[PDB]
């Protein structure tokens, strides 16, 4: 649920973004992905940099 699913949370947000409902605010999935993936390994030295 941290970085093996860094592809999977992006793919799930992309599959939710295939639904075009409220496309300005349909990046709430992208906001949850940007919170989740960057908050996955927030304790790091360089691995969060990319």
From Swiss-Prot:
Where it sits in the cell: the answer is: Golgi apparatus
List the coiled-coil residues.
Answer: none
Additional remark text: Present with 432 molecules/cell in log phase SD medium.
What does the record give as the function of this protein?
Specific subunit of the TRAPP II complex, a highly conserved vesicle tethering complex that functions in the late Golgi as a guanine nucleotide exchange factor (GEF) for the Golgi YPT1 GTPase. TRS130 plays a role in the YPT GEF activity of TRAPP II in concert with the two other TRAPP II-specific subunits TRS65 and TRS120. Required for both the cytoplasm-to-vacuole targeting (Cvt) pathway and starvation-induced autophagy through its role in ATG8 and ATG9 trafficking.
Q: How does the record describe its quaternary structure?
A: Part of the multisubunit TRAPP (transport protein particle) II complex composed of BET3, BET5, TRS20, TRS23, TRS31, TRS33, TRS65, TRS120 and TRS130. Interacts with YPT31 and YPT32.
Record-stated family: Belongs to the TMEM1 family.
This chain's protein is named Trafficking protein particle complex II-specific subunit 130
Gene name of the encoded protein: TRS130
